[PDB]
Symmetry: D2
Subunit: 356 residues, 4 copies
């Protein structure tokens, strides 16, 4: 008989609480695509949320969907039109690839393209599996001194890069980060790398703040039941001034309100967290002091920069990885994520190499 | 006996509903100030509001305050250090003058300076009187082909200039302006002067919209009881697309919500109207499509630009003046403003010249 | 016998002074391309230059090349993947279409993409012919109230739009335009549309300046043998101040030098003309007054905006068309261009419709 | 007899090669000025050049001028209107203080103000003396953990901050710095602090490059007689790509040419060095790839940011000081500067404290 064919075991969400490991066909790359032997894939709240509620806002799972969107792997095969990538190349994968060159792509903000393909956001299948095909322009070669897990960490790191950019974070800035979860952490890492003089991070958990301290947070503030004004007051009390930029990573109404009150006049409040459809905020306060309120939707043009920072050892994201499981233990990985302990959980999809 | 001294009759608000015409001492200009013989002064909701409620937000009249802040006049005397102005110069007066060169002034956003002096905003006396002294750097010479009233209109025009600038209005844009009151009208004139392809104005009053058409509105939409989503749909229906910029001039929650829904992704929603301390809005919607929410606080660096536009006949604000009264008929002018009929009302403070 | 097949008569440059009208095969559109029945094509110095010297700098004609790059036409057929365009649509054609989604395209500056395809720039064939295929994303639908010739004029107009953008031209600006040739003219049109208060245009020809006056130039200055300093002096003498932006459209060294001397501190000097490989300029002068020197290479993201301006009658480019010949009289059209009289010469490729 | 009066020994340049130490009257601070007891003052090519040639470009010493402009000191007395400073405050002095609030100051670019006062640039006296008065808004309080010498180093550091800002240096960038002199070194430190992934420094001296390595240069390239094109090739060869930003610090024509050839398309070439009045450069090359050429004139809005960076230990400029002499040994200090050996030389003006 013929030799055994390769498999494409995949982690699939069928509905709320219905997670399964099942085999999928092996993708065939189009002329401008590459087939990747998946290596490392980190998971975040969006994967867990789809698993728990089968949806996130209007993005709802209407049919079985493969999870995973923060990954790296090895090029297995390339399409006829691919020139910059060859079999064997280690690459980082940017999950958002435009389907059409609309005005948003031409102006340089492809992340806003309405018909964009995005891994693990229904109805687009993610990459928590063995073999995955992706647009070649959105697969970036990893330098030899950058690990697969670092390559996978580029996705969450890019959320922080995009956020700091939109906020205008720069040399000597005093930056406030609301939330010490993984989003706030990468945001902290980026702010410092961009030259922020002081970064103050707030959170409900003293443990998370302790970890924030470990990776660079200049100041931490544990929040309990203080009002938004009191929070802003305490923040300013610690800095000796008002932060020029605030990056809200919790999505909670009270925190958003605190950011408006805390941010220096002419500064920027970036909203990265996702909360309710409606939020009650002191717009009048913001307008009078020209505190801009800018939202963030994923990212654009961050991979090459993230790779340069990692290759030059300008940032250290490794401490963010707290657990790693082989793809086959995906369910245990998700149950672990739910326990709220840790920061970034990594899934190892390549049986031939389970290392970082 | 000696010759009669000049007088300095002033319109003063002593408290809610307490408006009086009384004589004030004649100001003496310091080294970097000039004394102006007031000529034309337009009034707006702010003056009228301080009269009715004795306050606007946290800005409250604690002692009698002279009203007026949109003016022009003639230089009567100059301080020992003034060199760009001499007696007889016709000038436009920018009401906001910084008291100290703090970081806001140095960075170029002096309007945000915390200790800024501003005419007719408690506790700073306005210029609805005969003689007024002001910082010479904030008094701009008017070209011969620009009238005193045009000079006075620079103040309200600058609100529109600052708003369109913050919104990023530029060549070819489709702009939505919520509110056809005087603020919306100047915003309309400025947007067109900046190259906007089409400006659509909304309002509750059919009469105000008709006037909007008269000065350049490409499209108008009268609003009754439609929902924010409906408003957004109607606007897009008329433009054939979503406007890149929305300038909200009413301050109403419903209108602000319509702006978020209507604005094109990656676009900007400018908040010029002043409403409630709190506003319930769909921030999530705005964040997902990166629709920025920028507030505005008066203006900075608009006088020279305004003068060049008027001097070159690039914009015409004359149609905005619907009534003019001599200073002595100030009460009648304020009663007229309440009638809600009309656009801009001008007060003439110089008895020797009541002309435009 | 079968019915007669359509022809694809094309204007081809074989070498210096070797211009021919010959039949080409009829292009077949790929999945993301459209086939256009060419209608109107304007010609400029680059077409004439390739004809005269068979090259422009390093861009050299190594094999017969079809000329033409400023055009519009009617969609004849669409590729399998085209959704936004159907047979019969009248469209404007943007000649520069990227071959790969490199970092320049992702950042929003696709014009800088190294491997970009560009009509009539060797070795890419242009569109002065009957049928031409082009990337569908770069073919824009023309509104009914916009003529084919206006659609073709979008290309040269876009040179002006891009130039004013890079220069930062905005409301109330005083702008200097060196050169009253067709480039300077569209630049003049754009500057005014963006809100420039005064535009001063210089040139060696009094006739060209007279035409500039006809289309909006606020001030004109005929240049003879004056030195760069004297030019700057005269320019400032006319404006009463220094222009915040200078757009050099001749490429001549002396003019570039005058622009540096004339431009206001902190302003911008945009280089649109093409001269020698080397230029001697007073960089020290520019640096001390922070006068930025920015080059321009064609354009990016201008078509939709140009179309909006034309459809709303915000700009009038029609006066630029001074002559029109059918494709078959292409040689006469080129000999006419060489006579230096006129501004824009239009070629009509569709025998069924030779109107504007 | 009465008590001995304090002295105000000053280092004065009377003409080419004529340097003297002589006593000056003690300044009396005006209402918005402060009198400083000078502590640390670093010197640079400008002071040394005024000494050797009695001029720099059009800036010429027409009467004896006190040298020095990179300093810090202690507040000895404050004007009747000063409120943010009191006797005893340790402060950093920003040498450039505007004499009038013109359009340049209002727009936020006060360094361009035509009538600005600037220490040690004829005809304005510098601060290499015992007592010096300055505008209070331009004297910044130093935190306790920042030394006087660090305060004095803010001046040269700000040249680098302004240069990197104008160049747009940001996260992940590959930056080329031409020249390893003190300007190139601070530029290097700032570029890294701003998040540049790799900074490559070029220079004629192998010794200066070794020092560059010591403070953070990722790569160094010694230049001998290669051509500009060759230099550009070598730089790219080492980076593996073209740098997005080039900061030219020598002022040499050949070097400026290399910068144009080396800089990535759409990138920026910042000219910090001062060379000849005229420079022959390949503008065409720069325009075709939209490589912007921006000059710089000192700085604006950098002191507060510099202080925050030093106070947070985000940058370390201490390694720049290679020698320190008391004011009285100024001649020896200037002779040492000519030796070309060393980086930054500090003069100690306060006899009661000669420490860093
Ligand atoms: Zn994620
Ligand atoms: Zn008003
Ligand atoms: Zn052309
Ligand atoms: Zn210096």
């Amino acid at each position: 008989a013929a030799a055994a064919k390769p498999n494409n075991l995949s982690l699939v969400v069928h509905g709320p609480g219905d997670l399964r490991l099942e085999n999928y066909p092996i993708p065939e790359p189009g002329p401008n695509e590459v087939l990747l032997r998946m290596h490392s894939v980190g998971i975040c709240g969006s994967d867990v949320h789809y698993w728990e509620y089968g949806r996130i806002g209007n993005f709802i799972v209407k049919k079985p969907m493969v999870l995973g969107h923060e990954a790296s792997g090895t090029v297995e095969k390339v399409g006829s039109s691919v020139k910059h990538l060859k079999p064997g190349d280690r690459v980082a994968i940017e999950p958002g690839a435009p389907r059409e060159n609309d005005e948003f792509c031409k102006m340089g903000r492809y992340n806003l393209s309405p018909s964009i393909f995005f891994c693990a956001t229904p109805p687009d299948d993610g990459n928590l599996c063995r073999f995955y095909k992706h647009n070649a322009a959105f697969c970036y070669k990893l330098p030899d001194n950058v690990t697969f897990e670092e390559g996978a960490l580029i996705e969450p790191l890019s959320v922080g890069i995009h956020a700091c950019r939109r906020g205008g974070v720069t040399l000597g800035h005093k930056v406030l980060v609301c939330g010490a979860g993984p989003i706030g952490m990468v945001t902290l890492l980026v702010a410092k790398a961009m030259g922020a003089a002081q970064v103050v991070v707030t959170d409900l958990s003293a443990t998370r703040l302790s970890k924030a301290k470990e990776i660079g947070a200049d100041l931490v503030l544990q929040i309990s039941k203080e009002s938004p004004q009191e929070i802003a007051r305490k923040v300013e009390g610690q800095l000796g001034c008002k932060p020029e930029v605030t990056i809200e990573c919790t999505g909670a109404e009270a925190s958003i309100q605190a950011g408006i009150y805390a941010t220096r006049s002419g500064g920027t409040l970036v909203l990265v967290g996702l909360g309710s459809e409606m939020t009650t905020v002191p717009l009048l306060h913001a307008a009078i002091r020209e505190v801009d309120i800018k939202g963030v939707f994923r990212y654009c043009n961050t991979w090459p920069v993230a790779i340069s920072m990692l290759a030059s050892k300008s940032v250290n994201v490794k401490p963010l990885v707290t657990h790693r499981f082989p793809l086959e233990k995906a369910l245990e990985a998700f149950e672990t994520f739910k326990k709220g302990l840790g920061l970034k959980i990594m899934l190892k999809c390549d049986p031939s190499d389970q290392n970082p």
